[PDB]
Design a protein around this ligand. Structure first.
Ligand code: 8XF
Length: 229
């Protein structure tokens, strides 16, 4: 009996629990449950991915079509916090991928640094994502921008990072908590307005979804960056 099944998204798996393949067998990051399966001399460990903590896990369980975070991908993660979701992104992209974890809080940054000691594919970048000129010499061009900065001007922030770091034809995945953008607008008005602003930065949404029952008035938007020459 095969207990843990590959999900439609490469590097993701189902166990109905979402899990990723643990890049650091034997270690939990935030108290999550681990599942190690041995058979003969073979062994593989997975980590449970809580959708009540991780917007990306909520989006995957909600039926998002693409996440673009895949094995081998180079990912610029804006708003990395203490590394909860980043750790699963690191699992997904694997040893040949890369995750830049941009977080401006020094306190959260210390959690990220501890997380990255074990994970060679995480680069902690403890900086303000509004000023990418300060860290641009550390960031090789990436395949995907994941953004969870929860700021009214986050589309402008993400776009500024896209213009500096995101390859033509690469993709973005943006988490949008509506009342962190404008708490006096409806969720629909916020999401419409952010989608519109993205299109004007040549960030073209390809799908969008909300995250009930895990989060209220919280969207994830996925799309493709198609900048001019
Ligand atoms: N959580 C965050 C927020 C930001 C910001 F808004 F300051 F640019 N930069 C990095 N991490």
């Amino acid at each position: 009996n095969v207990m843990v099944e590959p999900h439609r998204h490469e590097g993701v798996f189902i166990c109905d629990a979402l899990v990723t393949k643990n890049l650091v067998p034997g270690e939990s990051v935030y108290g999550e449950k681990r599942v190690s399966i041995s058979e003969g001399d073979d062994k593989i460990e997975y980590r449970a991915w809580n959708p009540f903590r991780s917007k990306l896990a909520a989006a995957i369980l909600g039926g998002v079509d693409q996440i673009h975070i895949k094995p081998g991908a180079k990912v610029l993660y804006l708003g990395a916090a203490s590394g909860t979701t980043v750790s699963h992104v690191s699992d997904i992209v694997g040893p040949d991928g890369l995750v830049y974890a941009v977080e401006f809080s020094h306190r959260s940054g210390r959690d990220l640094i501890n997380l990255a000691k074990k994970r060679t594919n995480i680069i902690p970048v403890i900086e303000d994502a509004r000023h990418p000129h300060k860290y641009r010499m550390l960031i090789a061009m990436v395949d995907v921008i994941f953004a969870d900065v929860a700021q009214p001007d986050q589309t402008r922030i993400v776009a500024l990072n896209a213009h500096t770091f995101l390859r033509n034809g690469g993709h973005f995945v943006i988490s949008i908590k509506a009342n962190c953008i404008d708490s006096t607008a409806s969720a629909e008005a916020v999401f419409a307005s952010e989608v519109k602003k993205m299109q004007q930065e040549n960030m073209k949404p390809q799908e969008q979804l909300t995250l009930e029952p895990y989060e209220r008035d919280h969207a994830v938007v996925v799309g493709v960056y198609r900048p001019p020459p």
